Structure 1
Amino acid sequence: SPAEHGYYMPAEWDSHAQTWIGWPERQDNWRHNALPAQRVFAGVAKAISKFEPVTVCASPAQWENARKQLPEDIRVVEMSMNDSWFRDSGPTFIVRKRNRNIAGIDWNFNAWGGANDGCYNDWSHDLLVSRKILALERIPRFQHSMILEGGSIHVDGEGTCLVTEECLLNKNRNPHMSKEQIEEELKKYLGVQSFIWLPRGLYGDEDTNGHIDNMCCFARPGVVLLSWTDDETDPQYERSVEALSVLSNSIDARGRKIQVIKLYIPEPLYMTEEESSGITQDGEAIPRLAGTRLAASYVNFYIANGGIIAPQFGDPIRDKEAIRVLSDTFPHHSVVGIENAREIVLAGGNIHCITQQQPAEPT
């Protein structure tokens, strides 16, 4: 019903009031009692806080630890969560030009595929994250019954929505809805007019089922960054070539062809034994096994007000080249490389997955 009052999802490069981030904890997903991941989340929050306000949300047991680790100008609030992926469990904010001029969408959530296919067995706290954030900020809430995660949608703020079929059409999401029915809900809720459907996401992203935000994103209207490799023996290659083909046959909501900038993935990363042994083994979440291909891409960066927060994976040549490409692509932003982003990818995500932008409310 956001179409009724002229709401739309702005592009991520439009002005933010603040960024929301969770705080990692669970010992069956985050190694060494999540301490290495905590230092990286703190580093991401601090980096962003140079550009715009940040609120970090931490569990009751973690609140003091978070407050101690984070700069004073970063707000720390108590919140229960099952895990710390606010891109996906937090609200998708929408605005209008004028009662209020901002709202948040609270989508249904099922831990990326639910009882049979999801990443963990209990998502009851995550179900409340969006409501709690919006209640805290006194921003109106639109609830939707469809299962959706913010990491599965990208917009250019000019009417186009970029998505994957792997995720949005998956049997573990909304199998009762056709492609056209899904598009219809996204038009009404995000204020978009047209879609670009990539068939697949990044190789190795079986746990999210191929979220767009680890595969391809907008840099500006008519221009995307695409995860790329020239190595034809990498299972990523066929996905990248297929996506490029689809993009070359796509037109955006304003009638533009799409320019594609290749953003080369790191050389293949595989979880080590020291890494896998630091994680508790039982049956509340998916097993983390030694030798699994890490789903790493530089495309999982976050845009803040005048800043680009980008991962660094410990691949010397590809890390520096990603910074060069991103600096060239966003010449009016400052690019900041986040070391030890590998610590987030071990848990199945990256910088974009841990953030949720709150747009500035228009006046």
Structure 2
Amino acid sequence: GFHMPAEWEPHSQCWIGWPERADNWRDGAVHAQLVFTRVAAAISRFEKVTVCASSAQWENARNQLPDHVRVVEISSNDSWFRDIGPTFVVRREHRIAGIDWTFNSWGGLECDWSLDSLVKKKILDVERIPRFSHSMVLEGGSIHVDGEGTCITTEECLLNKNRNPHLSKSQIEDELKAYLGVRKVIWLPRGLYGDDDTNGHVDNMCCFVRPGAVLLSWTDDKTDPQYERSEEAYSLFSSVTDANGRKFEVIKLHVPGPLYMTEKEAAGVFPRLPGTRLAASYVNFYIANGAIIAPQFGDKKWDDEAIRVLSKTFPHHEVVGIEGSREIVLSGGNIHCITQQQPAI
């Protein structure tokens, strides 16, 4: 009787990690920490925030973050709490639980994720919230829900042999149905071009706005490899209905750039290579209570256009652009990847 509510439904708080590993974040994560502070501070205007830092980083996080953000000590390999935090479910006796999916470092065998694996159970232990363990590998960034019985995902990620090669698509779909409380799963073939680290997480490709409506990463440039992925997703959405028999409205959200890691950015990481195409999309935003917390990549034309489209799309939410989001995407993710909502009960 539990289900995953939509991200726009009310939250009691948001969980965020704290970056530090010098081999993934340039210059010892100094720039990324400034942006994590900016994101946490912005979200905290709208809902309570907990930032989780290692022992070595706790004082730094506590100094940078404002007093009304809670700072706890939770050790991790890295700081992508969308994927390593628990996925909370509600039953409207316990009324909230967390799903502890198995983590495997985004298909990483094919190199240590043991601390990251413990993040789900540690957060649930802090909150004294029951844990539902699952042997299936899954990351929260790979699924999206409308809270009304529909889930969207990508085949590129969930059917990759680096995830659950013991399972067929039907078996995976049945676990999503049972654990997320959904009745229909929409399988986009592919996520964002260039998102090789996650194998095409849906949260970088498409998300719900409301039941029956999605934002879709888009480019008007038919010569760019993103075009065929976005067009294929657009065609799928235009050909199917949701779990309640609604047609989809699709709103295009144009990708920046393309953006590429510079020599200076790559040199700061102790592998991240000069010229690497960045997996950048404005779709990787977080919905906080009454707010959209949206990336800004330092590409003025597309940054301003994304704020315009998000403001029109979410007319009852305050849209907040976060300067410096390029510093998150240099390490492979964005605002949605670093957050995990806790639904209110």
Instruction: Please indicate the TM-score interval, normalised by the length of the shorter structure.
Output: over 0.9
Q: Aligned to 2:306, which of 322, 338, 344?
A: 322
- Cα deviation per residue 1:1-22 (whole Å; 9 max; x = unaligned)? xxxxx10000000000000000
After the TM superposition, list the runs of 4 or more consecutive aligned residues in structure 1 that deviate by more than 4 angstroms.
none
Written as runs of structure 1 = structure 2, the 5 A alignment for 1:157-172 is 157-172=147-162
Shift of 1:232: 1.2
Q: Aligned to 1:295, which of 257, 276, 279?
A: 279
Partner Cα separation in structure 2 for residue 267 and residue 247 of structure 1: 25
- Cα deviation per residue 1:7-61 (whole Å; 9 max; x = unaligned)? 0000000000000000000001100110000000000000000000000000110
Query: Which residue of 2 is the match for residue 74 of structure 1?
Result: 69
Shift of 1:289: 0.5
Instruction: Specify the code of the residue in structure 1 equivalent to 2:299.
Output: D
Partner Cα separation in structure 2 for residue 318 and residue 52 of structure 1: 28
3-state SS of 1:262 partner: strand
Shift of 1:195: 1.1
Instruction: Specify the code of the residue in structure 2 equivalent to 1:54.
Output: V
Q: Aligned to 1:336, which of 315, 320, 330?
A: 320
Q: Aligned to 1:229, which of 208, 216, 219?
A: 219
Greater alpha carbon shift after TM alignment, 236-245 vs 48-57: 236-245
Q: Aligned to 2:95, which of 95, 98, 101?
A: 101
Query: Which residue of 2 is the match for residue 185 of structure 1?
Result: 175
Tell me how large the CA RMSD over aligned residues is: 0.5
Instruction: Specify the code of the residue in structure 1 equivalent to 2:287.
Output: I
3-state SS of 1:13 partner: coil
- Cα deviation per residue 1:137-195 (whole Å; 9 max; x = unaligned)? 00000000000000000000110000000000000000111111111111110000001
Query: Which residue of 1 is the match for residue 255 of structure 2?
Result: 265
Shift of 1:110: 0.4
Q: Aligned to 2:331, which of 339, 347, 353?
A: 347
TM-score (norm 1): 0.94
Q: Which runs of 5+ in 1 are unaligned?
A: 1-5, 281-286
Partner Cα separation in structure 2 for residue 20 and residue 356 of structure 1: 5
Instruction: Specify the code of the residue in structure 2 equivalent to 1:322.
Output: A
3-state SS of 1:41 partner: helix
Query: Which residue of 2 is the match for residue 3 of structure 1?
Result: none
3-state SS of 1:47 partner: helix
Partner Cα separation in structure 2 for residue 323 and residue 236 of structure 1: 21
Shift of 1:114: 2.4
3-state SS of 2:56 partner: helix
3-state SS of 1:112 partner: coil
Instruction: Specify the code of the residue in structure 1 equivalent to 2:281.
Output: S
3-state SS of 1:182 partner: helix
Shift of 1:248: 1.0
Partner Cα separation in structure 2 for residue 132 and residue 26 of structure 1: 20
Written as runs of structure 1 = structure 2, the 5 A alignment for 1:179-258 is 179-258=169-248
Partner Cα separation in structure 2 for residue 180 and residue 115 of structure 1: 24
Partner Cα separation in structure 1 for residue 109 and residue 124 of structure 2: 27
Q: Which runs of 5+ in 2 are unaligned?
A: none
Partner Cα separation in structure 1 for residue 87 and residue 214 of structure 2: 21
Shift of 1:251: 0.8
3-state SS of 1:176 partner: coil
Instruction: Specify the code of the residue in structure 1 equivalent to 2:340.
Output: Q
Query: Which residue of 2 is the match for residue 44 of structure 1?
Result: 39
Query: Which residue of 2 is the match for residue 33 of structure 1?
Result: 28
TM-score (norm 2): 0.99
